Structure 1
Amino acid sequence: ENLWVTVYYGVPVWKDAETTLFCASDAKAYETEKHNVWATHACVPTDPNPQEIHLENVTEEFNMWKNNMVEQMHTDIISLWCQSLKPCVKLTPLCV
């Protein structure tokens, strides 16, 4: 009846956090390019059979308005918009 601690490795324990997410697009997105795709240059091919596990008895609290994957997406899109026009022809000797 005297209890002892016992270590467990692999417990469904998570906490809300923010990391660097990456992209993923089909193999066809990498196909349709004459340097024409504005992003897919270095995107990971998506898993052919995505898997969605339903977590029964689980009730998690969401908050769309203070979610960070949005900030990552937008600032990344901004940076991609930027970077796609650096090596392109500059019209400085215009404005005549």
Structure 2
Amino acid sequence: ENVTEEFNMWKNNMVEQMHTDIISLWDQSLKPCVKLTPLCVTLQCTNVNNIT
């Protein structure tokens, strides 16, 4: 009550901290995942069936 505080969503650092967070978790999870490096090979490809 009787409290006035200035706010600034654009200079707020919580968004920067949480963006850095999200990047960190994204980087963290896929690190113990299978590396798809043995797939970049020349693919022989043809047009696909019943399609629109």
Tell me which interval the TM-score lies in, with the shorter structure as reference length.
0.7 to 0.9
Task: Look up the equivalent residue of 1:81 and give its one-letter code.
Answer: W
User: C-alpha displacement at 1:91, in angstroms?
Assistant: 0.7
Structure that is richer in helix per residue: 2
Structure that is richer in strand per residue: 1
Q: Mark the runs of 5 or more structure 1 residues left unpaired by the alignment.
A: 1-55
Misfit runs of 4+, over 2 Å: none
Larger radius of gyration: 2
Q: Mark the runs of 5 or more structure 2 residues left unpaired by the alignment.
A: 42-52
Please give the TM-score of this superposition, normalised by the length of structure 1.
0.42
Aligned length: 41
Which structure is higher in RCO with an 8 Å CA cutoff and minimum separation 6?
Answer: 1
CA root-mean-square deviation: 0.5
Please give the TM-score of this superposition, normalised by the length of structure 2.
0.75
In the other structure, the counterpart of 1:58 is: 3
Spell out, residue by residue over 1:48-70, the C-alpha distance to the aligned partner (whole angstroms, 9 max, x if none): xxxxxxxx001101000000111
The alignment partner of 2:6 has SS state of: strand
